[PDB]
């Protein structure tokens, strides 16, 4: 399916972001087209097909709200939707609004350069397509370029090698195998108990332990769903008016004001309920080290109590960093897993990995022989997908160079020197710090509204004002630095790609507050942009 030679707006990516941009620009009466590397729609939910892949936000929150018909018709089945169900949802949306007619699959954007003479992007692909677009929307994701761990010998490994972010499209059979998983973030935590059910022996190679709390998944009562439907739009505006984009209770107390007994009774209640709302149990968990630590110890002790062998249990306890500052994980039978005969925790802080071998993995203490190795080693987050494209602005400035010390943006939406270019739910904005469907919807609507505004007013050039970008970047940093988030090496800071600048990339002030700023900006005719 050939892309058009010219279009008002070209969109890279057919995940949640790109698909809604396509939908909305069509409704705004703009020509629009999508380029996507994958063979079909879904983004993250197309690529991450590993067993156990699942929502970490409730199904009823992690969904599109732009269409009443979609909200009324779709029936979610569990508290936390599995990947295949999310993928059926996305397919349902794409079918309903005939989206694929606007998408070129199997195609990768390789370069894009702005032409000051015409105020347009020329965009090239790996199939040799050249498309000329007035506006360019990068809906290319946050967690979309898989990162391999940095160990030698990977290509010498004789067995089968997988990354969770590029999982095969037909079921992988691990029956009777000695299997290793490297990585114990959300992907490792989700996949490992699934593999443990097939493998003769599973070895989990943990570096820093992450905090995880129980999901307590359950079926969704159909009468609950039917009630919610009667007030769904209302329910969703409630979620938009929050820092996190969900119904999470914002606990008004300080974790330091309470007694040890009240702290325990309160956290015990969250622990039994399950899910991520414990993050907001007390207002200062992500702001005060001593407040954080009280919560952290409570979680650490629950972890100790889950695993019988206390030497194994202790190796699972997170240390060295504040609770909640690497993204919180929901676990289903992951801690319980290590009580099984056939599951072994390899502590690689104690015994670092030296090399992959043809037979398996060598640490400083011994060699582990394996038939398959699964990398749950994450992603080159936030900037990874952009940096794979040769994006050039005014004066032939490469985006990758301009951002070599960290992403530099105004509201996260655009960067000075690169006009008519917009980034969806990326650095400098709430992004993954909120329910991403709320982050995504707000960005798509703001961008596509801004674009409609340009056409309406016969303007053809939109650019962020350098001084406002610099002030935004400093603001992002200053507000991050009032939290505990910069204290820790996470993907939010880039600290998991060797050599990437260690800088907290996201806006921490909350979705609601961010959206307010955005609306004030557009209300004043896009203050901090120069439009011509």
Ligand X SMILES: NC(=O)c1ccc[n+]([C@@H]2O[C@H](COP(=O)([O-])OP(=O)(O)OC[C@H]3O[C@@H](n4cnc5c(N)ncnc54)[C@H](OP(=O)(O)O)[C@@H]3O)[C@@H](O)[C@H]2O)c1
Q: Point out which residues bind ligand FAD (CB under 6 A).
A: 12-18, 35-38, 43-44, 46, 48, 53, 55-57, 62, 108-109, 139-144, 385, 388-389, 424-425, 435-436, 440
The interface partner of residue 327, options being ligand X, ligand FAD, none and the CB cut-off 5 to 8 Å by kind, is ligand X
Beta strands in 393-513 (DSSP E): 421-423, 462-464
**Could you tell me the CA-to-CA distances from 354 to 170, 377, 489 in Å, in that order?**
32, 16, 21
Count of beta carbons in the 10 Å neighbourhood of residue 19: 29
Sheet holding 178-182, edge to edge: 160-163, 372-375, 178-182, 201-206, 343-347
Is the CB of residue 374 less than 8 Å from the CB of residue 160? no
The interface partner of residue 387, options being ligand X, ligand FAD, none and the CB cut-off 5 to 8 Å by kind, is none
Q: Whose Cβ is closer to ligand FAD: residue 215's or residue 285's?
A: 215
378 near ligand X, judged by CB under 6 A: yes
User: Whole-number minimum distance, CB 490 to ligand X, in Å?
Assistant: 7
Helix ranges, 1-128 (H): 16-27, 44-47, 68-73, 83-96
65 near ligand X, judged by CB under 6 A: no
Closest listed residue to residue 411, CA positions, set 427, 399, 396: 427
63 near ligand X, judged by CB under 6 A: no
Q: Which residue is nearest to ligand FAD (CB)?
A: 43
Handedness of CA 237, 239, 243, 244 (dihedral sign): negative
Q: Whose Cβ is closer to ligand X: residue 187's or residue 372's?
A: 187
Q: Please choose, out of 50-58, 98-106, 109-117, 313-321, the segment that lies near ligand X by the rule CB under 6 A.
A: 50-58
Is the CB of residue 498 less than 8 Å from the CB of residue 150? yes
Q: Whose Cβ is closer to ligand FAD: residue 35's or residue 370's?
A: 35
**Could you tell me the CA-to-CA distances from 149 to 262, 374, 512 in Å, in that order?**
42, 11, 36
186 near ligand X, judged by CB under 6 A: yes
322 near ligand X, judged by CB under 6 A: no
Place of tokens 């990398």: 375
The interface partner of residue 496, options being ligand X, ligand FAD, none and the CB cut-off 5 to 8 Å by kind, is ligand X
The interface partner of residue 15, options being ligand X, ligand FAD, none and the CB cut-off 5 to 8 Å by kind, is ligand FAD
Which one among 185, 243, 251, 428 touches ligand X, defined by CB under 6 A? 185
496 near ligand X, judged by CB under 6 A: yes
Residue 513 in tokens = 């507050």
DSSP code per residue over 348-413: TTTS-EEEE-SSEEEESS-EEE-SEEEE---B-TTTHHHHTSEEE-GGG-BHHHHTTTS---BTTT
Q: Whose Cβ is closer to ligand FAD: residue 368's or residue 446's?
A: 446
Q: Whose Cβ is closer to ligand X: residue 24's or residue 500's?
A: 500
The interface partner of residue 425, options being ligand FAD, ligand X, none and the CB cut-off 5 to 8 Å by kind, is ligand FAD
Residue 17 in tokens = 């972001």
User: Whole-number minimum distance, CB 447 to ligand FAD, in Å?
Assistant: 12
**Could you tell me the CA-to-CA distances from 24 to 11, 404, 446, 451 in Å, in that order?**
12, 33, 11, 11
Q: Whose Cβ is closer to ligand FAD: residue 108's or residue 357's?
A: 108
Q: Whose Cβ is closer to ligand FAD: residue 14's or residue 518's?
A: 14
Residue 347 in tokens = 């502590």
Residue 31 in tokens = 């020509």
Which one among 26, 88, 207, 344 touches ligand X, defined by CB under 6 A? 207
The interface partner of residue 18, options being ligand FAD, ligand X, none and the CB cut-off 5 to 8 Å by kind, is ligand FAD
User: Whole-number minimum distance, CB 356 to ligand X, in Å?
Assistant: 11
Positions in the binding site for ligand X (CB under 6 A): 54-56, 143, 149-150, 182-188, 190, 207-208, 327, 330, 376-379, 432, 491, 496
């Amino acid at each position: 399916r050939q892309p058009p030679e010219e279009v008002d707006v070209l969109v890279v990516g057919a995940g949640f972001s790109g698909l809604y941009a396509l939908y909305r620009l069509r409704e705004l009466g703009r020509s629009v087209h999508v380029i996507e590397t994958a063979g079909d729609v879904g983004g993250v939910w197309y690529w991450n097909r590993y067993p156990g892949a699942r929502d970490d936000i409730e199904s009823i929150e992690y969904c599109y709200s732009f269409s009443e018909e979609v909200l009324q018709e779709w029936n979610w089945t569990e508290r936390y939707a599995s990947q295949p169900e999310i993928l059926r949802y996305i397919n349902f949306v794409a079918d309903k609004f005939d989206l694929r007619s606007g998408i070129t699959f199997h195609t990768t954007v390789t370069a894009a350069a702005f032409d000051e003479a015409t105020n347009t992007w020329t965009v090239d692909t790996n199939h040799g397509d050249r498309i000329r677009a007035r506006y360019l929307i990068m809906a290319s994701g946050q967690l979309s370029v898989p990162q391999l761990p940095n160990f030698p010998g990977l290509k010498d490994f004789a067995g089968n090698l997988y990354h969770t972010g590029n999982w095969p499209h037909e079921p992988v059979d691990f029956s009777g195998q000695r299997v290793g998983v490297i990585g114990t973030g959300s992907s490792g935590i989700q996949v490992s108990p699934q593999i443990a059910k097939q493998a003769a022996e599973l070895f989990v190679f943990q570096r820093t332990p992450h905090f995880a709390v129980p999901a307590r998944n359950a079926p969704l009562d159909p009468e609950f769903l039917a009630d919610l439907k009667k007030r769904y739009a209302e329910f969703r505006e409630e979620s938009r008016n929050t820092p996190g984009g969900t119904h999470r209770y914002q606990g008004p107390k300080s974790a330091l004001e309470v007694s040890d007994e009240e702290l325990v009774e309160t956290l015990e209640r969250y622990w039994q309920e399950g899910g991520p709302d414990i993050l907001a149990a007390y207002r200062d968990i992500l702001r005060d080290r001593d407040a954080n630590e009280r919560v952290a110890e409570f979680i650490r002790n629950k972890i100790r109590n889950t695993v019988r062998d206390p030497e194994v249990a202790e190796r699972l306890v997170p240390k060295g960093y504040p609770f909640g500052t690497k993204r919180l994980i929901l676990e289903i039978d992951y801690y319980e897993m290590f009580n099984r005969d056939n599951v072994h925790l390899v502590d690689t802080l104690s015994a670092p990995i030296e090399t992959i071998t043809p037979r398996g993995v060598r640490t400083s203490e011994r060699e582990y022989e394996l038939d398959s190795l699964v990398l749950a080693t994450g992603f080159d987050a936030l900037t990874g997908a952009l940096f794979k494209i040769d994006i050039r602005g005014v004066g032939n400035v490469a985006l990758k160079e301009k951002w070599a010390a960290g992403p530099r943006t105004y509201l996260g939406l655009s960067t000075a020197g690169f006009p008519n270019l917009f980034f969806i739910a990326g650095p400098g904005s709430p992004s993954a710090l909120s329910n991403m469907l709320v982050s995504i919807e707000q960005h798509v609507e703001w961008v596509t509204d801004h674009i409609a505004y340009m056409f309406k007013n016969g303007l053809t050039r939109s650019e962020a004002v350098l001084e406002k970008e610099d002030e935004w970047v400093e603001h992002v940093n200053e507000i991050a630095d009032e939290t505990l988030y910069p204290m820790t090496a996470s993907w939010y800071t880039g600290a998991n790609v060797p050599g990437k600048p260690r800088v907290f990339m996201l806006y921490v002030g909350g979705f609601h507050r961010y959206r307010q700023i955005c609306d004030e900006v557009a209300a004043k005719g896009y203050e901090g942009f120069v439009l011509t």
